[PDB]
Structures are given as C-alpha cells and as structure tokens.
Design an enzyme around this catalytic site. Structure first.
Site, PDB file in Angstrom:
ATOM      1  CG  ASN A 224      -0.783   4.206   3.714  1.00  0.00           C
ATOM      2  OD1 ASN A 224      -1.761   4.670   3.869  1.00  0.00           O
ATOM      3  ND2 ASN A 224      -0.692   2.711   3.112  1.00  0.00           N
TER       4      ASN A 224
ATOM      5  CG  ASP B  37      -2.299   1.112   0.749  1.00  0.00           C
ATOM      6  OD1 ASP B  37      -2.525   1.201   0.172  1.00  0.00           O
ATOM      7  OD2 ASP B  37      -3.069   1.101   2.221  1.00  0.00           O
TER       8      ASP B  37
ATOM      9  CE  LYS C 200      -2.966   4.612   1.006  1.00  0.00           C
ATOM     10  NZ  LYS C 200      -5.011   4.889   0.531  1.00  0.00           N
TER      11      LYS C 200
ATOM     12  CB  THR D 226      -4.461   2.726  -3.001  1.00  0.00           C
ATOM     13  OG1 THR D 226      -3.857   2.331  -1.660  1.00  0.00           O
ATOM     14  CG2 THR D 226      -4.618   4.039  -3.370  1.00  0.00           C
TER      15      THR D 226
ATOM     16  CG  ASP E   6      -2.888   1.370   6.400  1.00  0.00           C
ATOM     17  OD1 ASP E   6      -2.828   0.219   7.259  1.00  0.00           O
ATOM     18  OD2 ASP E   6      -3.671   2.023   6.908  1.00  0.00           O
TER      19      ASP E   6
END
Lengths: 20, 341
Positions: free
Chosen positions: B162, B157, B159, B192, B175
């Site tokens: 985060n 994840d 991005k 995502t 996260d």
C-alpha cells in the site's frame, strides 16, 4: 534459514486484505 | 515548543480537514474525459488503471469499483469512508485524490500516478533494506500516523503493497478502503493477516494502537526481508501473533530490537504509540536519534533509493493484468446506497 523458509512459502506475493 | 510547533501544525491541519470532511467534494469529472491505458492492479476490491486526462495530458491512477460488487462484499460504508476521508486529507506522504465520480455501474477515484511502483516490489527484489533505509521510510509512516490519528482516523491496512515510491524516493500511502474516523473503540475484522494486532484477531474493541503494532511489522519486514509472523495459511499466522513471542535476525541492531519489542507488544498498556507520551515515545527512541523529523516532512533528506524514470505513462514497475472492459449499464445501480459518493 528463516529467509529460505519464507521464499519457499505460499505468501511471498502481494497479500490480500481480509474481511468477515 | 519542539512538540508544540507540532501542535500548531496539527491544529491548522485539523481545521483544514474538518471543512472538507463536513463538505465533501463530489462529481468532479467524468469517465469520458480519460483515456484508458493499462490495468496496473486488480483484486476483489476493484481495480486500478493508468489513465491519461485529455484536457491536460496528465497521467493518473484511476480506481474503479463495481457498485453491485461492493454491496455483495458488504463494503458500502467502508467505501463511503474511503472517498470522504481521501478527499479531505492533505499530507506529503498520502496519495492525492484528484477527482471522484460515479455512473450507472461504477465508482471512480482518480489519484496522482506514481510510476515508481510499490515498496513491496522493490523490497522483495532487493531482499531487505539496511536499517538507515528502513528508518527513512519508517520516519515517513511515523509522521503520517501522527497526522492521521490527530484527525481521529485509523488507517488499518499498513503493508508494503500500500506504499508507493515517488520520483523523489519518498513514500505515498494509498488505499484507504478500511480507513475510518472514530473517537474511541471500533470492532471490524479487517486488515491483512501478517499485519493484524492481537486485539483484532481476538475480536476485542480496538483503537489506533493497531496502526502502531502494524508499524512494528513493517519495520521488521523492511529490515529483515520477511515478516515477524509468517506461515502458509492465515490461521497459522494468527497463532504466532497471539503467542507473545518474536524472533529477530542476528543482524538487527540492539536499538532496532528494543524499538520492535515495544511496537510488537501484546499488552496495550505498554505498547509505544498508545501511552501518555503518545507518538513521542517512538520519535524520541534511540533508533531514530539521527532522524531529523522536520527535514523528512520537507523532503530535504536524501533518499536511499530513487526508482528509474522511464517517462510519464510508463508502466514497467507494475505487473501485467487481464484487461476487462468498463461496462456501464443503461440502468442506475445502487443509487441510494452510494448517493453521497
């Protein structure tokens, strides 16, 4: 411009993760 | 022995991790030891609150998951992954899990508090990062993925949302809700939309190469100010991703574009990070020719940006959310599902 297209989009805020 | 000093560090990192992985920390605090201050994040996958620990006066970020809501979203195994991985890892650019516990209703993960806010916040407001600025952050993620992937972890994840900015201007990855320890291939549709590699979208078995693809996306977004693949709805994003085509802003240097072509490579047999040379194809590319990798790890490089300090406890870098009470039922919910938490 590419920037102007991004800023007018619905996806300039925090993006949620996806799942099934 | 440049790349072999790296191996001595990584073998010791692995010993340290395996001890905690095989014997995870459990029940190390209780809710009423913390004063609740502010919600600084929400979402389908729980919420995050600024809390103060009474016995020390330290501030922390406390993630709260509703057990019944996790079950409904079919994220039991993913939540068990998150907590077991985070309690076992130790790297300068990962957020530290200080406590974990559960009660009748919820799960709690207490992390160190980063008043500086997320990269997302700062990037959108400033518009874009210079290449040197983008490079500094990207070097930290390169080292972090080196670390994680050597432990057989895929992160899944990456991005700006985060990545938190600390008081020294360096990054912390938070996260771990989709992080997994896997040798070989895995299949879950997660991540995502803007950051997903073609192989995830196409429901193929995939591996840690998807993290290297996502790095491509992040570097691009940092340096351009917008992602390489954007549209108003996810399905339009996925078509762009699977097309094989990518357009670069005119201000992107020829070294950046060439790095990016190799990270955002649909062909897994040619994607940097995934080849015989591994992470070194990235670490030794021309774009990172000025990057002193050890100096980055030790945090002795001067940061391009240091967020304004307004105190411990300050929440000025986070948005305002609706405050929801912490309900704790008198009956235990989902006991068997979350027994190991």
């Amino acid at each position: 411009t590419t920037y102007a297209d991004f800023i007018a989009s619905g996806r300039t805020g925090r993006r949620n993760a996806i799942h099934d | 022995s440049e790349q072999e000093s790296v191996k001595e560090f990584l073998a010791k990192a692995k010993e340290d991790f395996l001890k905690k992985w095989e014997n995870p920390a459990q029940n190390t605090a209780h809710l009423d030891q913390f004063e609740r201050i502010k919600t600084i994040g929400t979402g389908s996958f729980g919420r995050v609150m600024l809390v103060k620990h009474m016995e020390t006066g330290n501030h922390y970020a406390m993630k709260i998951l509703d057990k019944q809501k996790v079950v409904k979203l079919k994220q039991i195994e993913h939540t068990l992954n998150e907590k077991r991985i985070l309690q076992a890892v130790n790297f300068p650019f990962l957020v530290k899990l200080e406590f974990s516990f559960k009660d009748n209703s919820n799960l709690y993960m207490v992390m160190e508090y980063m008043p500086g806010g997320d990269m997302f916040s700062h990037l959108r407001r400033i518009g874009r990062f210079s290449e040197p600025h983008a490079r500094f952050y990207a070097a930290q993620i390169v080292l972090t993925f080196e670390y994680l992937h050597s432990l057989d972890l895929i992160y899944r994840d990456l991005k700006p949302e985060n990545l938190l900015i600390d008081q020294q201007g360096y990054i912390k990855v938070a996260d771990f809700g989709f992080a997994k320890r896997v040798k070989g291939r895995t299949w879950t549709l997660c991540g995502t939309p803007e950051y997903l590699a073609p192989e995830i979208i196409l429901s193929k078995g995939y591996n840690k190469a998807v993290d290297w693809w996502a790095l491509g996306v992040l570097i691009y977004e940092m340096a351009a100010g917008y992602p390489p693949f954007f549209a108003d709805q996810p399905i339009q994003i996925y078509e762009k991703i699977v097309s094989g085509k990518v357009r670069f802003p005119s201000h992107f240097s020829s070294d950046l574009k060439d790095l990016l072509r190799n990270l955002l490579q649909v062909d897994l047999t040619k994607r940097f990070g995934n080849l015989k040379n591994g992470v070194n194809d990235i670490k030794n590319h021309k774009w990172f020719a000025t990057t002193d990798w050890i100096a980055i790890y030790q945090r002795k490089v001067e940061a391009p940006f240091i967020p304004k300090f307004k105190g411990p406890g300050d929440t000025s870098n986070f948005d305002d959310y609706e405050e929801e009470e912490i309900r704790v039922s008198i009956n235990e919910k989902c006991g068997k599902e979350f027994s190991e938490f």
